[PDB]
Amino acid sequence: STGSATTTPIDSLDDAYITPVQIGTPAQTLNLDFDTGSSDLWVFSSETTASEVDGQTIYTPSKSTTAKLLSGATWSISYGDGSSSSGDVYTDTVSVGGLTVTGQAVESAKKVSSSFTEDSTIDGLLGLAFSTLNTVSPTQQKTFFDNAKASLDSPVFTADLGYHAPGTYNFGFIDTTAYTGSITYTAVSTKQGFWEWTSTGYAVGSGTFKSTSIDGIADTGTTLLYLPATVVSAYWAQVSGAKSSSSVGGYVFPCSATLPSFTFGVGSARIVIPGDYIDFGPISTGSSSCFGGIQSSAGIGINIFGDVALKAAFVVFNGATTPTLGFASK
């Protein structure tokens, strides 16, 4: 089997991407944030504290003839931005782009933190990291991909995120029309539950490539690119007026700037992020100071190849017995 679904930016800055997912019988379609940095499929629901729902579409398990309460199971998660959610668990039929999993754990939120409430466009998350990170207790549950894998034509999914435009998540096949050149595959460590890999270096603009190992995670849930402070300083030093602002929370730059590109290495291959992918717009409405899309990972404890990086590539998440990642230009 295969599946193919379009993923759409939630706003004009590509702050996140939503992908429609069918849950239950008859189907209830919710728009989920596909997140290769976590492993829970959770949704706003008829159980979510009413004051914490503000415009999201909810899953109502009592209206699904295939929903079954997973007795005694609870979940609770907290994300890298400090947001969180928790609740109980059903199993139900879940379909993505024509690919169906029966008996998928659907984690129903009873509580969500303010950033979830305040974002009406995201109805939940669909985790695509390794199932070892799943938070369901006392019996850990499998991701949608893990459940689907054995049925897929090939045990892979691909992320093809757009810059200020829709893109595609495919399951079970590699669309050879979706990229240029070849796909370069690179080793993955699953020891922390992530799609963790080692980039071979970077360049800023038309500058020379610096060969240096950068260990980090391919994380579709993360908006920005988080790299070591040395690398990030070298990038922003090429932008007149750019500075790190403690009050704002990162590097900012004059909105009048023309940003240089940023290149990262995948083996001997190179992925070029155009400068405009690095512009996240005014820090507050009407400001002439703009927020940068490349930020320091100092304090995070891990480097994160988030959407800024991934949207410059066609990315293969290869879930073979030994997982690997593939990157192609496009």
Ligand SMILES: Cc1c(C=O)c(-c2nnc3c4c(C[n+]5cc6c(C)n(C)c(C)c6c(Cl)n5)n(C)c(C)c4cnn23)c(C)n1C
């Ligand atoms: C260690 C880490 C992260 C790891 O991932 C991270 C991060 N970066 N984007 C996101 C996340 C997103 C994506 N996301 C970002 C958004 C931004 C920047 N803005 C203005 C809006 C309105 C957003 C929405 Cl609705 N959604 N979502 C939905 C969740 C649950 C995230 C959790 N963390 N996160 C940050 C800021 N940090 C420090």
